[PDB]
Amino acid sequence: QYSIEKLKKEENSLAKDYYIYRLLEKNKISKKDAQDLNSHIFRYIGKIKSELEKIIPLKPYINPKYAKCYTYTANTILDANLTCQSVRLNSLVFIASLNSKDRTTLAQTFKNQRPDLTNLLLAFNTSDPMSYIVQKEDINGFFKLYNYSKKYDLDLNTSLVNKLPNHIGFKDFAQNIIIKKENPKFRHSMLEINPENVSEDSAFYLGVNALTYDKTELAYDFFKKAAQSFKSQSNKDNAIFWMWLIKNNEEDLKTLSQSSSLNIYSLYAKELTNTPFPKIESLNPSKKKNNFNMQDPFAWQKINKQIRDANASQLDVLAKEFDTQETLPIYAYILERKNNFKKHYFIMPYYDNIKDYNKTRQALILAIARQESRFIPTAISVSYALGMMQFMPFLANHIGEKELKIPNFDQDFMFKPEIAYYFGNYHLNYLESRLKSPLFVAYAYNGGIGFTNRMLARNDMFKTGKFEPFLSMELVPYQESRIYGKKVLANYIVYRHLLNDSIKISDIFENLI
Numbered sequence: 001q002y003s004i005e006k007l008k009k010e011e012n013s014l015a016k017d018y019y020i021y022r023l024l025e026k027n028k029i030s031k032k033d034a035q036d037l038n039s040h041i042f043r044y045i046g047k048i049k050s051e052l053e054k055i056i057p058l059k060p061y062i063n064p065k066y067a068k069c070y071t072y073t074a075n076t077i078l079d080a081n082l083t084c085q086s087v088r089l090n091s092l093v094f095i096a097s098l099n100s101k102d103r104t105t106l107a108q109t110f111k112n113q114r115p116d117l118t119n120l121l122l123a124f125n126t127s128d129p130m131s132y133i134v135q136k137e138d139i140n141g142f143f144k145l146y147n148y149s150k151k152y153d154l155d156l157n158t159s160l161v162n163k164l165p166n167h168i169g170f171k172d173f174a175q176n177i178i179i180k181k182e183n184p185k186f187r188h189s190m191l192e193i194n195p196e197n198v199s200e201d202s203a204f205y206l207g208v209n210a211l212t213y214d215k216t217e218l219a220y221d222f223f224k225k226a227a228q229s230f231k232s233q234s235n236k237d238n239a240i241f242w243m244w245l246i247k248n249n250e251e252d253l254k255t256l257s258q259s260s261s262l263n264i265y266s267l268y269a270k271e272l273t274n275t276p277f278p279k280i281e282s283l284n285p286s287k288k289k290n291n292f293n294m295q296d297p298f299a300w301q302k303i304n305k306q307i308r309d310a311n312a313s314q315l316d317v318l319a320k321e322f323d324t325q326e327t328l329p330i331y332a333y334i335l336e337r338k339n340n341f342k343k344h345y346f347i348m349p350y351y352d353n354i355k356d357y358n359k360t361r362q363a364l365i366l367a368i369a370r371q372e373s374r375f376i377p378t379a380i381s382v383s384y385a386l387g388m389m390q391f392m393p394f395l396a397n398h399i400g401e402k403e404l405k406i407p408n409f410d411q412d413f414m415f416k417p418e419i420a421y422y423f424g425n426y427h428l429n430y431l432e433s434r435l436k437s438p439l440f441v442a443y444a445y446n447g448g449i450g451f452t453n454r455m456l457a458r459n460d461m462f463k464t465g466k467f468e469p470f471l472s473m474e475l476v477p478y479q480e481s482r483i484y485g486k487k488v489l490a491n492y493i494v495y496r497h498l499l500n501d502s503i504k505i506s507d508i509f510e511n512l513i
């Protein structure tokens, strides 16, 4: 392990963060060590921030211009200057805490210059502030109230709902209430949003919303708008798939089957149309090694940064240097960026560690590794998941120390490919024995078996229905897991194909119900 003094000499990165976090959790960072340490942290968010703050709390920040404004309370705010009054009224909790006579006074003070504040003040003088703000069609107020409390729910008329998409909060609002199946009056109201007023993710979610109310014509119009506006081909394909499922225009399915993006939708469309499986690149570097240490996490952070900030020209230089067997995962990574995501790279590095598993298991392992890490041995996530299979420390230590009783086990062994694949196999066995489907296994790998079980216990998820299992896949209640499953499923299909163990993706879909 590295001392704090040694780490401080490394460039700031997630790897340096991880090793600082390891010192913090072992109580090895003194109050003195901690003094300059925020400047040594690359991403000062989450557990590293809360551990550091147990040693040195942060006070900040109050803009010194307004410090005096924060010496008033709800009982003394009428003594504050007008600037201080309006700063403190940025907080809806602060407004809620005022007495109603003071809300009336302040509403009058601000009626001319700040009718937004007046609207919220008089709204909080009623038993339903959301109803008041909706009657005013105060869009900024609406979103401030929703952020304050998700519990408000009311029917919204055609005029009001068509104004909501112009506000930056709309996309997360729509996503959250549709996926969480919350705020039903708001959800029903959003059926009247004109597709002309939405785009991209928002249009797509509004298509999903319309399907849940069996408004299939409105759903088609939203999905069509999403397909026309999405920046990424994979998302466009997801929208075209819905266009096809709803109205069965064979030009939509034809366009989907010819996509440059390899995803479950394009793979499915290819299968339905007797279109050949997409071309998978074959990478076989003749040069066997270079000088790069594939086991140094710091070296990976540094080369990743360079690769991501390389121009079109510098990528060709890095491609050549890393065109070796030993650095195959870095090579494929460089090519994927360098060919602008047009070529399909599905490598199988360190294959000797999995070649004795059955091919279906090989493909599942490889499918997970590809999405988790792109096979980078020293991969570290923002939550400090580790190595090719991206194990969290807690589970790594549980398996390595308690279950397998590996002598001298340390969580950093997860950076060794033999260990990653072996532990991945071990955990995938647990999950698959309980869940069966590779899609459900992927949900549970990323999101946990508890979340997956709770989702599958629901009456409205992965049951029979007109648009199942595709609808359920859109309603997986955690965005990261919803995305992850779709990607890992595609990878799985590809690797099964590459291992001469093909399965029709239609069989996978049938088995979800």
Ligand SMILES: CC(=O)N[C@H]1[C@H](OCC(C)(C)C(C)=O)O[C@H](CO)[C@@H](O)[C@@H]1O
Binding pocket: 370, 371, 372, 373, 374, 379, 380, 381, 382, 385, 390, 446, 480, 484
């Ligand atoms: C190294 C790292 O941050 N890996 C994360 C992965 O990132 C995706 C990819 C392509 C490997 C990138 C962007 O590095 O996304 C997964 C969720 O889909 C996470 O479970 C992984 O922890």
